[PDB]
Amino acid sequence: SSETVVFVSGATGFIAQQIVKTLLEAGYKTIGSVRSEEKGKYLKSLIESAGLNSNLFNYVIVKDIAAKGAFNEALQAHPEVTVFLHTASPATFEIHDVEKELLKPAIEGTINALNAITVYGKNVQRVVITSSYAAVAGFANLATPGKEVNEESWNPITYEQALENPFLGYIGSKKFAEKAVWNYIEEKKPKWDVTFVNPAFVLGPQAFAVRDKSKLNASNEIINSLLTANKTKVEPQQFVGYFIDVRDVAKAHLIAFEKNETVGQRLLLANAPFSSAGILDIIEKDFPELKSSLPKLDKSKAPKFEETESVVNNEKTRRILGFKFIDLKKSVDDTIKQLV
């Protein structure tokens, strides 16, 4: 343990802050990449206010993961890094050019991190890539409803199909960033081992603080848009799929470098099906002070699970992780409790 030093790219993001929190709670020396000095100081202050050992956390400034050589200076300054958690990637549909704002920042950010690790991360033994269930199952025209998917399945979406719209663009960004790692391992044959963490829709509370209660990270807006509709008058879009709580995703990233069976594995981080209506049901029962303000969901606008969703078999992932997942009710409750 004392010899382990974990680097986390994009440390201010939703999942990454929970990873950083989980690492510090476990006592790991942690180095977080951030886009600015003020973002680094902000995260250090959150860590200190939470009562954690902030001497365990340092930050490096990496303004743009997409820039060639992005992580070079950081790893040069930190030759003690033995684990690299590459989590940073655009996770938003608030973009206009898929290719410029999703594909290449994801793909080249990832290729640049790997080149930086191989050249300046001489002590890195384990690399963990935050991928996505998006790389595992097909979507929209490529949906395979009722077909089993598991840790070995791939989304067949082509590069050109990813260009169609921002949702498919994000999906393709994850599939092709992941393919880029596998191809890098084949071509460069690095000495480090790789593990992938592939989460479905990630729900749950922020690690330390809600910056702006009006708008959370993109996946948690599935919850928050039900809360803010009363004020914004914006009809909430309804979703169906699989969910996972952010704290299980964060724990999975530690398992990913702590265990030997995870080498070369894609950990499929999916708990159970969800729908927007089912989340609304949890909210109205668990927070009666909110039923006054919750929207009336048009059942005709609701995606039906059986029409689109593959059937996840992640028994292997579940065995390797070895802990019980947080269920949807707790995940939603804990998210709301930070907003109410």
- Beta carbon nearer to ligand NDP, 94 or 289: 94
Tell me the C-alpha distance between 185 and 169, whole Å. 24
- Nearest approach in angstroms of CB 242 to ligand NDP is 10
3 state SS of 234: coil
Footprint of ligand NDP on 246-285 (CB under 6 A): none
3 state SS of 314: coil
Determine whether the annotation assigns residue 219 to a binding site. Answer: yes
In this chain, which of 4, 82, 110, 132 binds ligand NDP, going by CB under 6 A?
132
3 state SS of 114: helix
State yes or no: residue 104 binds ligand NDP (CB under 6 A). no
- Beta carbon nearer to ligand NDP, 18 or 161: 18
Helix (H) and strand (E) counts in the chain: 13, 12
CA atoms within 13 A on the CB side of 251: 15
In this chain, which of 81, 107, 181, 202 binds ligand NDP, going by CB under 6 A?
202
Q: How far is CA 262 from CA 79, 138, 233, 270, in A?
A: 24, 24, 46, 17
- Nearest approach in angstroms of CB 32 to ligand NDP is 9
| 13-21, 160-168, 182-190, 320-328 -> range binding ligand NDP (CB under 6 A) | 13-21
Footprint of ligand NDP on 51-80 (CB under 6 A): 64-66
Tell me the C-alpha distance between 99 and 23, whole Å. 34
Q: Name which of 155, 152, 188, 154 is nearest 264 in CA terms.
A: 152
Site residues (vs ligand NDP, CB under 6 A): 10, 12-16, 35, 39, 64-66, 87-91, 105, 130, 132, 174, 199, 201-202, 217, 219
Annotated binding site: 10, 12-15, 35, 39, 64-65, 87, 89, 91, 170, 174, 202, 219
